[PDB]
Write a protein that binds this ligand. Structure first.
Ligand SMILES: Cc1cc2nc3c(=O)[nH]c(=O)nc-3n(C[C@H](O)[C@H](O)[C@H](O)COP(=O)(O)OP(=O)(O)OC[C@H]3O[C@@H](n4cnc5c(N)ncnc54)[C@H](O)[C@@H]3O)c2cc1C
Ligand SMILES: Cc1cc2nc3c(=O)[nH]c(=O)nc-3n(C[C@H](O)[C@H](O)[C@H](O)COP(=O)(O)OP(=O)(O)OC[C@H]3O[C@@H](n4cnc5c(N)ncnc54)[C@H](O)[C@@H]3O)c2cc1C
Ligand SMILES: Cc1cc2nc3c(=O)[nH]c(=O)nc-3n(C[C@H](O)[C@H](O)[C@H](O)COP(=O)(O)OP(=O)(O)OC[C@H]3O[C@@H](n4cnc5c(N)ncnc54)[C@H](O)[C@@H]3O)c2cc1C
Lengths: 590, 590, 590
């Protein structure tokens, strides 16, 4: 032992917690810390972005993709405030992340000096830890605690660090890392009494349905086995599609807008719901469970029990263990009209989606772009999805399995999350295929950072949907609005921009050219190039499954006619028809 | 009278306050308000940007450039948080602006619904008004008050508006605008007792100096007349250069880094300072006034009196009236060694700058880019300046007069302020030449919005300094840092990007090509095109005037030699030599 | 089913969560809610206090004493802000509590009306839930969630409720309680690998010590058995004395100021520390563990592992199970010089304390007041302790066992916590003896609420130490201050005030009268009277065990002489003497 630079102690602590990547932009108020990076064999690396928000989002998405604890830095003032969208996303998603806000040196604090201000209020509302380092010697301790807190509290830990502190020297025995003491609780078994109560309700239900959220991640096979055992269809959430085999016979999709027709119809006809590992945000406001008779919930967070609906049975514990216990105790069901009707309803929907995906010629639609992705993507591909309409609808098309990872900004829903997501993913899995699926609006908020993928040799495939409008937005106007006004724009050449950035650009606007273009894009990505595919698509909007104008007892002949014509849905059949075909009756229609 | 839509009443109120331009991006949580724009002959227009932060900054810069009250909108959640850098800039600069945060409809509040959250904490720390509208019927009243407050309190007024409120209808007599009652205080005359005290100190001073901040805006001729009357050199601030004729004989420039050599030397040799209309932030931390004997301050804000230094004389009132009263009462001074020495020191500095600006051939440096701007710019050109080193140094080169306007993000110093500044300026003065001077780092945070200038036919000239690094940052490292690490990057083709966006791009890397390129760029701008001049410059750093290694009694022969060699400053002469040449002695050197 | 008043639904929800007591003061902005209390057989009762802070503290202390979830209300504005000290105490102690802030009716919000303001910022920093109800119909849901959150997050849940909402009527099926779904994790078993690592270190230690915090509550017998098995002395925290039998042979007390001499000496001579269920706040700043060689920590909160000191062994899990596993695996130790030395050191300290407690005549000191309490208190008495010096020192005197409960405001340390503590305790255990031990300063901040105990027939015994000064404060001055100034005051007749309030008052100032007075006070309390014993004590300060001036190798003969004389500690013997008597040597002295 002897003496050590404070900045270096900080880097040693970060490395001990596995936080080997710092995202951000170099600046005077952060230079002392960054100067310590490297040296004494430290392996903490710096990934420089073009906009600090991309750095924050990348640090966060890194964890969402199963990577190490991310660290993002923002220079005093504007750099720090630029981290906001990334930090809010992490806070709402409960993702651990350490944010270091640089600051003018201690002597300048409170003097109303240049770019000097109190940054403590900035993130106090969303952070699990938010402190302004009071003196140099305690910086190591606070960085260590920030990492410990970010992880233990599953959130944003923020430290404001005067720029002169990291230069200070201390005795090597005046700092330590608590990373070695990191402990996490292993899956906890559920109460038998609660499992038994659930089993009884499921055994006696005439129309059971499993509604699985990410709490079931890693246990899709078990959930599918249970679905088959008791003949209960499966509904998933917009965040949990990868948990199931895309072609599972009883997968109805998700409910509400970013969902499928089957799930939306199933939930309104269901009797008993097994709500496993979910905190579905549309539950109350969209009346998702308005027709259900019994509600069983499984969750590891007591705060979630009975939150989205009254729970007749509450099971506290790991969804895996709970599903396993339920699967083992429930009675097998050989035949079920409810199940048969649902399987046909799902098949009908798949026929529709397949027809759209496999068109041979004409103006390119996003349906065929997704078709090309399915035909060229690796089986373990990673998908970083932005928040637009054309991108969220990817869950209706991508043929995923648990070998894939699909992540976005699902609750805060910040636009521009795709590119940073790709950075975090590629940083964690350098030899894995990474796709960033982005709408033009979201791309326009972050494309300058495409150069970051180029510069750091982290090749990704950017699929950009261009249609001179914010689809989702403009698409909703036609409903909640009796007008429209402003929502379109010129046609920027994204392929050319990509080339100017050192990336490879492609442009496609026809269905018959899509396969070849995707093939070339993928081959280029395998040659180590970051690619941008500018997909000039139509103004077509994904069919609104939250408002299915198909049942003749819910809508007029004219409405159904127009609905079918607009969405090329002539062959879609209302669920009630399939129910009646199996001898059942709708529980709410008529 | 009769009934009126709430959204329309809001637009009528905004129009009454002169807020005829709303900046932002359309979204579901803002559609009801936007739907009212237009109709019933309302003249409020919407300017759609690519990133909400540019919308916020543009709304703010609009006022900085003397335009109308700006309004910026951000969709619930991410759109709202994206406004942060623009709002913090306005708060610190005390610029009025109205920010409308969209929100999920009332019924969804507190339900933990999609993209639903409490946004009241977001800007509470910096806003002068920050309220969440409680019910539809009071929205008009609160928008009216927000405008009234933004203006009266010179700051950010924030309203969080549930998206269902603007759809509601009310009686026409249930709303009103207080814009008609808008009143502002006219310039207030200073206390004679304080003016007399100032005059006495100035009359008896052997080395007077006028330090003028933007409080003197509009009164540069008077300040120059006073300087000549009592033979007191003039020091200005980084925000106040346009107030003086660039070639005024006694203009020493500004102190500290973004300044000139003369001013930095003058302030350390001065006896009496007339601090007029300034809140210079480096005052205390850089010891700006450490050698002054007496300090006289003029300001209209009592909170500023005696803030930056003990004031021997404090004058509360308009700087114009105060300067006029002082000018009238002070004794004329015919000859002054102090004045003569300063004039020679200034001339010496101007010789140096002129030599750099007029080089004929070689690798392009930012000096020659500014030279070309001076040779082609209109006399009333508007300059929107970003915060980098190469851009802030523009005050050493631009030949401005009060006919020009030069604005930036001077205190919060957010990068990317230039492009939005150009939007706000061009929106206010459509027939006026507007220049956005940007460094590559700042450009990279905002270039996607170049398309906004194109789309709305608001032609501006973007001058981009590219050198694969953050100069300012990397430039300081060589001093405060004994290392460096990460601060460079690849070379993106900004001209090509501009073309892809519908703008005209130019690339220049040689001094001998600069004039022609600038000529073509300007002609293109006069043809209605937004232009981007990608200036590939050297790694040269502007000479550090905060650390002048020229006086042989302050630095070694080797240091001076190296300093002169690195900054091509062989001919720069330390101020002490000019003082001694006039029979004076340094008051602090030796 | 049918229709139900919203206020009543709220009361039904509170009752379902076990929150049957609301503390506060009636007001217009809370009347609609309170009007629902009772009726339809609801059993939620209202306990009216004189100052809202006492209501908040009582609601919080109710849970600290093992009672039901407390609810405290504060009228819009001043009533709400008056809750602050109680809420901050709960936040820092991680105690669940629901705080309802009344508010002017919805129509008045944002109108700058009378006593109308945005109260969301008020507690945002400390709350685990903080929302302003947006409309009447969701009030029930939010009250239900606030209770769920307060409990699950172990903290303060705050709701701002417009006064017109509770009057609204809704369908009975439009509300529900999630109380039925309340689930908590049962004690979790620790990792065998970590237990084994701990056992190895304990087996090989020459000077083991158990440092037990409240995490060990309910397992004192096991901790004592382990201490005896491996011959490891026990150190407790200021919050955990009741966990041990007061006369346990190896109890050394607590470290730092509110502690005993033995513990303070033991920790500095210890080699291996078993830090069980503690988050001792003085750890780092007082260098508590500066001389220890190995540190083993047991805690159920990952955020605490390695927080107060580097942990050589970290055990995540219930302290009970961990202590049981360690006890079972460790090797028994028959003899130990370390143990013998500690037992003698403890005995020496007990001789000193006993001598002070048993004086027969003279001016009353707090020592003899505690002696009288020990001689008249029930074996299961409850102690509500305030934060002054004379009250915190109660841990050196009270002869407690796990049958007792001792609670205070230990971390935030708000003065005046005693009386509200007594209210919460008596409300929970009506047939149990409750003592409020208060210093004059703290009593002076809350004595008007003595009438609350009288009014609600919740008889408690208030023991007040009066000495015309803030002891603790003035006591520290003589050290950290080279002066004093202001810290004393007149002599108010607290007994007379008590009588004026309907309570029974007693006054005592002599040791020979203490027993009889305490006897009469207790008998009066058993007659259903709230009592106030005004104990006029000396200016004597409890001996400073954080600075033991007894060892001749650490302090001068004169210092020791003066120290012994001032604190009547002639017979106290420095621990080093006992160590050397057993053949051991100090590891840090000399
Ligand atoms: C523009 C946009 C549109 C969208 N549209 C839709 C839509 O139409 N439909 C839709 O469904 N989604 C949609 N989403 C996504 C949606 O907003 C939600 O984020 C998502 O549905 C939440 O999914 P979840 O319940 O799986 O997980 P979360 O909300 O993350 O909740 C997961 C739950 O699992 C629990 N849990 C975690 N681990 C375990 C474990 N081991 N055992 C048990 N429980 C555990 C947690 O405590 C938590 O309660 C959209 C998103 C965007 C951005
Ligand atoms: C990267 C960067 C570097 C910079 N470097 C420098 C540098 O080296 N040197 C430098 O000087 N600046 C520099 N600046 C700008 C600097 O930070 C300050 O913003 C600027 O100097 C403040 O100038 P000011 O005093 O004129 O005005 P302000 O700070 O705006 O203060 C103006 C004052 O005038 C008063 N006032 C207003 N109206 C009137 C009136 N009618 N009568 C009287 N008083 C009135 C106000 O109350 C106020 O006190 C830099 C900025 C950036 C972004
Ligand atoms: C004026 C004043 C003076 C004071 N002076 C002193 C003093 O000199 N000395 C002193 O010691 N105190 C003193 N105190 C009290 C002191 O401030 C602390 O509040 C107290 O010491 C904290 O005690 P603790 O560690 O037992 O519990 P806490 O700080 O409450 O921490 C308890 C820990 O136990 C863990 N835990 C909980 N349940 C379990 C479980 N089942 N299994 C495992 N772990 C669990 C928790 O996660 C937590 O980390 C004073 C207080 C006041 C007001």
């Amino acid at each position: 032992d002897n003496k050590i630079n404070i900045g270096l102690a900080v880097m040693k602590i970060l490395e001990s917690w596995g936080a080997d990547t710092i995202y951000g932009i170099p600046s005077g108020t952060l230079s002392s810390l960054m100067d310590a990076m490297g040296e004494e064999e430290n392996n903490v690396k710096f990934l420089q972005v073009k906009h600090e928000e991309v750095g924050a989002m990348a640090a966060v998405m890194q964890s969402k993709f199963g990577g190490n604890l991310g660290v993002t830095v923002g220079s005093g003032g504007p750099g720090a405030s630029h981290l906001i969208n990334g930090l809010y996303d992490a806070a709402m998603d409960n993702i651990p992340v350490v944010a270091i806000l640089g600051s003018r040196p201690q002597r300048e604090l409170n003097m109303d000096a240049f770019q000097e201000l109190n940054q403590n209020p900035m993130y106090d509302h969303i952070a699990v830890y938010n402190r302004r380092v009071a003196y140099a010697e305690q910086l190591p301790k606070l960085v260590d605690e920030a990492a410990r807190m970010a992880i233990a509290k599953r959130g944003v830990a923020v430290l404001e660090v005067p720029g002169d502190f990291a230069k200070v020297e201390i005795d090597n025995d005046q700092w330590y890392s608590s990373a070695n003491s990191l402990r996490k609780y292993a899956p906890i078994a559920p109460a038998a009494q609660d499992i038994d109560a659930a089993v009884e309700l499921l055994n006696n239900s005439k129309r059971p349905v499993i509604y699985a959220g990410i709490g079931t991640m890693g246990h899709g096979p078990a959930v599918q086995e249970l679905a088959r055992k008791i003949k209960a269809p499966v509904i998933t959430t917009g965040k949990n599609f990868e948990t199931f085999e895309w072609d599972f016979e009883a997968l109805t999709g998700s409910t509400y807008r970013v969902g499928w027709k089957p799930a939306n119809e199933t939930i309104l006809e269901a009797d008993t719901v097994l709500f496993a590992g979910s905190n579905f945000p549309f539950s109350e406001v969209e009346g998702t469970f308005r027709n259900v008779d019994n509600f069983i919930q499984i969750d590891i967070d007591p705060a979630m029990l009975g939150k989205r609906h009254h729970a007749d049975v509450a099971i506290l514990g790991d969804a895996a263990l709970a599903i396993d216990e339920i699967l083992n105790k429930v009675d097998a069901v050989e035949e079920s009209a409810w199940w048969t009707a649902n399987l046909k309803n799902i098949a009908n929907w798949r026929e529709y989606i397949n027809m759209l995906e496999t068109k041979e010629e004409g103006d390119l639609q996003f349906y065929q772009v997704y078709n090309a992705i399915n035909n060229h993507a690796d089986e373990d591909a990673i998908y970083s999805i932005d928040v637009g309409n054309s991108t969220q609808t990817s869950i209706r098309h991508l043929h995923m399995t648990p070998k894939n990872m699909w992540r976005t900004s699902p609750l805060f829903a910040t636009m521009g999350i795709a590119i940073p997501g790709g950075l975090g993913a590629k940083n964690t899995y350098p030899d894995r295929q990474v796709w960033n699926i982005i709408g033009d609006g979201a791309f326009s908020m972050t494309y300058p950072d495409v150069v970051t993928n180029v510069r750091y040799n982290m090749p990704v495939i950017n699929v950009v949907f261009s249609n001179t409008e914010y689809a989702f937005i403009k698409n909703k106007y036609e409903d909640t609005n009796k007008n429209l006004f402003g929502v379109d724009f010129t046609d920027v050449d994204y392929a050319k921009i990509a080339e100017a950035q050192g990336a490879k650009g492609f442009t496609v606007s026809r269905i018959e050219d899509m396969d070849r273009v995707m093939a070339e894009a993928v081959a280029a990505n395998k040659a180590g190039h970051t690619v941008v595919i500018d997909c000039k698509i139509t103004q077509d909007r994904p069919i609104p499954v939250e408002t299915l104008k198909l049942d003749s007892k819910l809508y007029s002949e004219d409405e159904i006619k127009a609905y079918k014509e607009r969405y090329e849905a002539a062959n879609l059949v209302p669920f009630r028809e399939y129910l009646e075909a199996e001898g059942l009756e709708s529980k709410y229609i008529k």
